[model samples]
Every structure is written in C-alpha cells, then in structure tokens.
Target: MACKVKAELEAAFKKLDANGDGYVTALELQTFMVTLDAYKALSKDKVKEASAKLIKMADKNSDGKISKEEFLNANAELLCQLK
Candidate 1:
C-alpha cells in the first residue's frame, strides 16, 4: 500500500513539475495539492504535509521554501526512494 501511494505521488510530482523545474514552491504546491484535494486525490492535510516535507528535504538553504530546481531534484530523489 505504501509503495503504491509513493509511486502515485511521484508520478503526480512528475506531472506537476511539467516544466522540469527542480522544485515546486509553496505556491505551486498549494495549487497542485488543492486541485488534487478538490478532486478527492488526497486529503488537504496529507497534501499540506507532503508539500511541507518536500520543503524540508528540497530546500537546502533552509529558507523555508523551494526553488524550481530544488523541487525537481528533491522530488526525483524522493520518488526514487519510493521505488
């Protein structure tokens, strides 16, 4: 179950980062997550926490956010781990 969930999330990440940016900012994350939540993809809290974790992992500068490059890199790394 966990593996399935991770794969789906990773696939979603790839889809969301359509431009190949490394990182998705809170704004981008919020937009994506909110849209998914509206469509019953994930609960709002789950989306929020996942985005927060992405920030925690991807935001290397500790600036409490992520750049496009950072988001992509982080998402890729995280997705691989899921595999």
Candidate 2:
C-alpha cells in the first residue's frame, strides 16, 4: 500500500513540477492549485496565499520549495484522503 501511494505521489509531483526541475516552487504549486475545482472560485491572491502556506508546511529545509521526498512525506495523509 505504501509503495503504491508513493508511486502515485511521485507521478503527481512530476506533474506539479511544471519545469521538470525536480522541485516545486510556490508559483508552480499556486499555478496548479488555481486550476483545481476547490480553488477555481478563489481569487488569484487567495490561491497564492494558500499555496504559500502549503509550501511553508512542506518545505522543511526553509528553501521556499518542495522536493519529491518532502511532497510525499508531508502530503501522505492528505493524498490518502483524496485517493
């Protein structure tokens, strides 16, 4: 189960890493978040705020970006719910 979850998370991370740089910047995350149904009705600023908070939560290294490992570990529970 964990393996499958990680696989899916990696795939999702790849998609979110728009530039394929192995890192998801706040802008990249915001870009993707704004397209989701839940955030569609939100203003651009609102979505940007939310994405910043999310990046802060997942960016343990204080680098202002999320790595694949960080994305997987931080979002495991949330992704399980989505699954």
Candidate 3:
C-alpha cells in the first residue's frame, strides 16, 4: 500500500508541476487546491496559507518550491493525504 501510494504521488507530482518547470510552487499548489471540493470553501487567503505550510514542510533546501524528489521523499505520508 505504501509503495502504491508512492507511485500515485509520483504521478501527482507531474500534475502539480503545472508549468513543467520541474518544481511545484506555492501559487500552483494554491490554484490546484482551490479546485478541490475539500478546499473550494476556503478563502484564497486560507488556501495560500495552507500551500505555504505544505511547501515549508517539503522544501528541505528552503527553496520555496517542491522538487519531484523532495515531494516524494520528504513527506510521502503528507503528500498522500493530498490525493
């Protein structure tokens, strides 16, 4: 199950990359989350706040963005919850 979740997360990372820029930015994540039912009710400010927290969680190098490897390896459990 863990392995399967990792694979799904890898796939999700591509989608999250948005511009194919090889990274997921807080703005991209916030935009994506706004489309989700779970986050649809959130204010834009709330969504931005959440994305910031998520980026901080996975951004090991303090780069302000998530690399594919960082997203998968830094917090698989948290990323899984986003699915």
Candidate 4:
C-alpha cells in the first residue's frame, strides 16, 4: 500500500506533506486550513481550531500528525460523496 490516493487528491496531499516525508504535520496544514474557502472568512482563531480538529481526526495513532494513508483513510468518505 503506497498510499496512492486518486490523482486529484494526490497533489493536494503532496503539497501539504512538506519536506516530502509522506507524512503531513498539522503545522503544514495550518496554512492551507486558514486559506481554505470555507475557513478563509472565519477568524484566524476559528481556522486554527479547525486545523487542530482535523489533526485529531486524521492522526489515527495519536502521533500528532498524519501519514498519507491516514489522510486518505480519514477523507475517504468525503471523496466518494463528492463525486
């Protein structure tokens, strides 16, 4: 299992996996979270909270970050629901 998400999703995850480590830290996601269309208009504090929850939801091992597999797994429902 190489964590090969759908092509569209792969780039999204890759961009967040800073340092090319295949794992994405909440620190890396924070910027994206703040700028996400849904969150961009929200206060910075709210966006931070949102990113925190995302880490909690995606970090399956309580590791404080998420690997590619964890990301795909966590977002799998949304993936199918959208298209």
Over 1-83, each residue of candidate 2 has an lDDT whose tens digit, in order, gives 34444465555455555465545453455454445434333433554466566667655665544355346334532344431
- Winner on lDDT between 1 and 4 is 4
Model 3 agreement with the true structure over 1-83: per-residue lDDT tens digits = 34443465555455555466555454455454444434434433554466556666665665554455345333433444432
CA lDDT scores, all candidates in order: 0.48, 0.48, 0.49, 0.49
**Model 3 alpha-carbon drift over 4 Å, by segment:** 1-10, 13-39, 60-83
**Residue 3's lDDT in candidate 1:** 44
The weakest ten consecutive residues by lDDT in model 3 span 74-83
lDDT tens per residue, model 1, 19-43: 5556544445556445552324443
RMSD of each: 14.3, 11.9, 12.2, 12.3
TM-score of each: 0.26, 0.27, 0.27, 0.25
